[PDB]
């Protein structure tokens with residue numbers, strides 16, 4: 001990879017993408033996968049378990065390469081880009097959020113290519129709803145995260161993991177079930193941050209969630225079944241269709 | 255990956271490692287690959303073309319995972335470590351050294367997790383022998399690298415690529431033919447930096463070279479043939495053996 005463009009729109013395109021994990025070569029996780037993630041819009045990726053949603057997120061971070069087809073970022077293949085440049089443009093928060101044993105300010109800074117001020121760290125923690133519980137500590141942001149493995153709450157962990165990606169100011173934000181542990185209060189904080197903010201109105205967001213309520217408000221929804229796009233479009237468009245998306249939502253609480 | 259130990263010795267172990275590129279599943283590039291990279295020692299990896307030397311370097315950066323066996327860093331599997339933590343501990347320079355279109359000081363800083371001073375940037379460039387030609391520019395270190403693709407010399411590119419990894423201060427330095435373009439003058443600069451320096455006397459170095467002259471002075475030599483360790487040991491030990499290493503060196507200029 002050589003590409004490090006100073007201006008990235010954030011357009012993501014999957015073109016006939018097929019993938020199988022290198023340890024399971026012929027078990028097609030993805031097959032003929034085609035969609036487009038538009039910059040400034042939040043696209044929700046939903047579907048049944050084992051469909052390939054997290055696999056899609058892995059391919060977007062160039063953790064794996066597609067066996068067939070192309071994963072395109074701003075027109076060029078993802079492999080053409082510099083690895084560390086991708087880290088500066090693409091950030092992903094997950095329901096697989098592993099802290100360290102270091103201070104909270106070190107956990108938030110993470111792989112940042114600079115030294116962030118306290119005003120900067122407090123800001124992203126406030127937007128992620130992690131500032132309050134951190135400020136309650138005697139050592140504050142210098143408090144080393146517990147090596148206990150459960151020294152912290154579920155949502156309080158995700159709040160730290162969220163702020164970690166916010167401070168990166170990525171062009172592409174991938175949320176892999178990183179909203180499940182958050183309460184509706186902190187949920188709205190994220191939603192308003194992604195929807196009702198001028199900062200995140202220029203960036204593309206991939207919201208992977210099992211919570212159809214969150215996908216309901218998304219600008220675009222990708223329904224994934226058997227490793228392929230079963231349906232596509234907004235909530236209303238998918239609703240009147242009365243197919244995969246609708247049937248899945250049909251069985252819910254009104 | 256969760257591991258981010260504040261103290262890393264740098265011990266690298268390959269244990270019965272077998273690998274095949276995910277696009278070519280049953281073409282065994284590596285098979286029963288076992289060796290140990292000792293901290294504070296420079297280990298040279300040599301062998302015929304297509305043996306798997308660069309593949310080994312790829313596995314060490316966790317770019318790929320072994321289909322069989324284990325790649326161990328300081329006792330724990332490489333996948334157990336945090337991805338961005340690995341970037342802070344493991345740095346690799348290659349004969350595949352792609353610059354950008356940004357300033358020389360930005361190319362050297364690269365993926366650094368902080369903001370480096372000019373004293374710091376000049377130091378690594380001086381040690382890599384890149385300070386002189388950069389200082390000759392009117393804009394100095396702020397000179398944007400040419401988008402021409404050949405605006406710079408071969409060795410002058412490698413000198414910049416070398417300093418990029420030096421400033422990272424990695425526990426594991428991987429040199430994938432990153433010495434071929436350097437003259438014997440700049441060669442000695444690297445050699446003295448790796449051998450005759452207190453800074454690099456505590457770190458492990460993997461020197462991948464086709465230049466047997468460089469491997470001759472290494473603390474340890476790994477001969478790779480058909481994806482496996484044919485022979486092992488220092489220069490003299492491999493010499494008296496009179497096998498793979500010796501025979502390859504037997505045909506040379508005395």
Ligand SMILES: Nc1ncnc2c1ncn2[C@@H]1O[C@H](COP(=O)(O)OP(=O)(O)OP(=O)(O)O)[C@@H](O)[C@H]1O
Pocket residue numbers: 021023024029047048049050051052053054055056
């Ligand atoms: N590391 C891996 N190695 C091999 N196979 C895997 C790996 N990770 C996932 N798979 C397989 O790939 C399929 C897709 O998994 P993926 O995690 O993308 O599904 P998902 O849509 O995230 O599921 P859920 O909706 O339950 O989170 C799964 O059936 C799983 O068995």
Ligand SMILES: Nc1ncnc2c1ncn2[C@@H]1O[C@H](COP(=O)(O)OP(=O)(O)OP(=O)(O)O)[C@@H](O)[C@H]1O
Pocket residue numbers: 275277278283301302303304305306307308309310
């Ligand atoms: N990206 C790739 N995809 C598929 N196969 C590959 C890839 N890279 C290398 N190979 C194959 O793996 C084998 C090992 O390649 P590798 O680059 O490790 O050899 P090497 O020891 O670096 O060779 P040389 O000494 O000529 O540099 C080669 O025969 C090559 O055909």
Ligand SMILES: [Mg+2]
Pocket residue numbers: 053054
């Ligand atoms: Mg999953």
Ligand SMILES: [Mg+2]
Pocket residue numbers: 307308
């Ligand atoms: Mg090679």
Ligand code: NI
Pocket residue numbers: 083084087337338341
């Ligand atoms: Ni990386």
